[PDB]
Structure 1
Amino acid sequence: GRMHAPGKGLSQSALPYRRSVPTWLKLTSDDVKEQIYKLAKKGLTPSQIGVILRDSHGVAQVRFVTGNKILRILKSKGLAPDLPEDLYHLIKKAVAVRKHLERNRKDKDAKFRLILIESRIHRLARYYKTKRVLPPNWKYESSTASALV
């Protein structure tokens, strides 16, 4: 079930058994790498890059063509973002909720949802600090987190 909801949804991707490059796909691994570089330079997160490559260029899975994952490729080329995109989007959502709550002080539902969002933020940040992805002194403070956005 969801971490912060009573939902028990099942909807997710189902990878095919075959791990090979599709026969239709004629892009070399380096071609996919350069397309990834271009999309990252455009200002896109790895999830967006994967979605675009799947929808338009027919790249069913970048890991199966290049032997590497999109975030690893971005890091190896040196153009990966400062903090992971899931944590970034969680902080962005928290910032939006706080901005809404500043001008709507009677919204208890917004306060409850903000509590849930910040709990998720803290859990993800602790995990990232454990993996040395974030500096050990990193902390999410709700005073200037809009700069992190």
Structure 2
Amino acid sequence: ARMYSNGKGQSKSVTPYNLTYPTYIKHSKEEIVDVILNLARKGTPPSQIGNILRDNYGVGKSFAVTKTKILTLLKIAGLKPVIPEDLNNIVKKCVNIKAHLAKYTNDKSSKYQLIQMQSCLYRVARYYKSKNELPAGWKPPF
């Protein structure tokens, strides 16, 4: 089940059985690889890179053509971010809640949501600072 609440949803998307090569498409390998690195330098998250490749350029799951994963390609090109993108999105939501509570101090429901959010940050931090993906003395922006 869900980690912070009583949810038991089941909405996911199916991974294919085999992957082949997308011969119906209208670009070369080298063009697709160029499209990714452009979208990266403009500052898009890698989950959004995937959405665009599927929706506009017509490639499912973005790996059948490249034999390599999106984040690994960005490390080969040297475009790696300073913080992993998951930990980064958790710090953003915390900041937002603290900026709301700063002006609407009375909101007990928002107070409740903040302590849940903050717990999740530290649990994710401890993962990354074991795999050597963050400096040992990293601390939140707060």
Do they fold alike, i.e. is TM over 0.5?
yes
Cα deviation for residue 80 of structure 1 reads: 1.9
Cα deviation for residue 22 of structure 1 reads: 2.2
Hey, what does 2:140 align to over in structure 1? 140
Identity %: 45
Q: Deviations over 1:50-83 (max 9, x none)?
A: 1111111111022222111111111110112111
Question: Secondary structure at the residue paired with 1:103?
Answer: coil
Q: Deviations over 1:20-73 (max 9, x none)?
A: 222312433332221110101111010111111111111102222211111111
Query: Equivalents in 2 of 1:82, 1:26: separation in Å?
Result: 35
**C-alpha contact 1:74 1:80 (8 A) present in aligned 2:** yes
Hey, what does 1:44 align to over in structure 2? 44
Query: Equivalents in 2 of 1:131, 1:29: separation in Å?
Result: 32
**C-alpha contact 2:19 2:64 (8 A) present in aligned 1:** yes
Hey, what does 2:53 align to over in structure 1? 53
Specify the code of the residue in structure 2 equivalent to 1:88: N
Q: Deviations over 1:91-114 (max 9, x none)?
A: 101100010011111111111111
CA RMSD of aligned residues (A): 1.3
Q: Number of aligned pairs? A: 142
Hey, what does 1:11 align to over in structure 2? 11
Hey, what does 1:101 align to over in structure 2? 101
Hey, what does 1:73 align to over in structure 2? 73
More helix by share: 1
Query: Equivalents in 2 of 1:133, 1:30: separation in Å?
Result: 30
Query: Equivalents in 2 of 1:141, 1:74: separation in Å?
Result: 25
TM-score with structure 1 setting the length? 0.89
Hey, what does 1:129 align to over in structure 2? 129
Structure 1 segments unaligned to the other structure (5+ residues): 143-149
Specify the code of the residue in structure 2 equivalent to 1:127: Y
Query: Equivalents in 2 of 1:86, 1:102: separation in Å?
Result: 25
Structure 2 segments unaligned to the other structure (5+ residues): none
